[PDB]
Amino acid sequence: MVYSKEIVREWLDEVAERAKDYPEWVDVFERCYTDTLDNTVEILEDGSTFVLTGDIPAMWLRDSTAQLRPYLHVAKRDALLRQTIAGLVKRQMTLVLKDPYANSFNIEENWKGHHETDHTDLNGWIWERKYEVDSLCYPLQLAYLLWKETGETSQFDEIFVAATKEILHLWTVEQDHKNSPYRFVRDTDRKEDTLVNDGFGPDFAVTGMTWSAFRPSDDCCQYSYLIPSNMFAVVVLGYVQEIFAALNLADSQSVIADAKRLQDEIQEGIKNYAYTTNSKGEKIYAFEVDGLGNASIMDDPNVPSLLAAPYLGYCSVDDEVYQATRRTILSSENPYFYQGEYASGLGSSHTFYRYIWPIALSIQGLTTRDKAEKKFLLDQLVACDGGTGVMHESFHVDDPTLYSREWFSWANMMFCELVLDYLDIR
Numbered sequence: 001m002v003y004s005k006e007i008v009r010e011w012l013d014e015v016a017e018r019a020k021d022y023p024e025w026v027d028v029f030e031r032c033y034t035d036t037l038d039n040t041v042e043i044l045e046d047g048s049t050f051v052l053t054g055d056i057p058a059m060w061l062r063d064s065t066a067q068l069r070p071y072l073h074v075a076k077r078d079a080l081l082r083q084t085i086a087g088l089v090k091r092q093m094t095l096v097l098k099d100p101y102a103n104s105f106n107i108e109e110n111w112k113g114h115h116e117t118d119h120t121d122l123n124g125w126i127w128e129r130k131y132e133v134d135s136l137c138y139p140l141q142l143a144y145l146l147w148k149e150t151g152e153t154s155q156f157d158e159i160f161v162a163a164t165k166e167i168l169h170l171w172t173v174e175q176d177h178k179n180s181p182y183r184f185v186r187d188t189d190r191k192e193d194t195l196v197n198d199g200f201g202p203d204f205a206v207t208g209m210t211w212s213a214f215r216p217s218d219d220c221c222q223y224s225y226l227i228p229s230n231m232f233a234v235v236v237l238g239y240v241q242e243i244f245a246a247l248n249l250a251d252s253q254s255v256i257a258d259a260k261r262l263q264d265e266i267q268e269g270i271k272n273y274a275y276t277t278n279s280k281g282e283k284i285y286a287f288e289v290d291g292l293g294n295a296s297i298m299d300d301p302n303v304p305s306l307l308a309a310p311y312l313g314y315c316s317v318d319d320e321v322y323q324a325t326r327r328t329i330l331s332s333e334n335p336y337f338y339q340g341e342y343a344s345g346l347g348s349s350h351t352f353y354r355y356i357w358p359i360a361l362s363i364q365g366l367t368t369r370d371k372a373e374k375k376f377l378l379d380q381l382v383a384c385d386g387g388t389g390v391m392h393e394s395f396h397v398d399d400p401t402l403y404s405r406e407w408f409s410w411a412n413m414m415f416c417e418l419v420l421d422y423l424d425i426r
């Protein structure tokens, strides 16, 4: 009901042929690709698409985009799967209108989720209301990628236009968080799951960048201007300009000018505040800054990450500042960089010490021109699966049979992305 088994099986046959020298990769690729398509995607009563992030009836705007993105290739062939992806954009934009500050949404207005512990404005559609700038980038990215890869335009409907307007309004309000209607307190002993200053967050100055409460990891920002999410915002604001001009959408002149104004202001904020200096004295990107002079040197495996900046389309992989940042991220100068017997890579505040993330190994391969480095990382990913033949959230560098999240569809899909990239399937 969501795709053509005939068309998808033939496409996978072709990929397996292209990858015939890499049977270990094919086994995992097919397992990953089929599981997401068969077990996480459902068509709702209104013909729109709901994608399960994991193992409860809630969809993250972030995971759902990254889960479906690698199906864009076969959606060039499979018309029905093309509609399913369009239906996901439609669902995302509808939910953005329900509450543009929420990261995660229920399948229906059922009041499931975190309401018992969370003090914030809530409705029945909200699973979790952690505001993460990237949550609002991902649906815009998906709408744009669907259009570019397949030519599909039905996703650019009135709900799309209204939701785009909501995103621009919110990001603009959050250029000075003193004016924000958003507050968040969770009754928990885990500091990462709540906001300091009774739900308002840490101190900041106005920088031109847009404020975030939490990171793509779902843990709170230390400083409020998250460089990778503002990078992603700059990219998708470009997309908004393109889409409104091309499709002659309602209020395009106003929306295009607004998006451009905001893109330029965030870009100038990045120029003015996002940079710092590493141990060697090289200019690098910081992870989070507050505009008060504080700037962290680290990266988090969750995307958008600094490591993923070229993958997100923010800058060239060849860029000097990016490369210096990359060398810094992938070293012990980054406090989340962990080295062990099986692998070295990136952990997170979100997971245990010494556990590193497959998603960051995949992004590491997606952001190098060196095909030998891509192949090395793909070999490492499959070798570090604890014998499960799928991708986990994190695994211990000294023993990958110790890992978190048995079923992690976004991680499975990032592995698929790197295989396709290695094979020049584009």
Ligand SMILES: OC[C@H]1NC[C@@H](O)[C@@H](O)[C@@H]1O
Pocket (backbone or CB within 6 Å): 053, 054, 060, 062, 063, 216, 217, 218, 302, 303, 350, 410
């Ligand atoms: O998969 C849902 C959620 N898990 C924690 C992080 O990986 C975050 O990025 C993700 O959205």
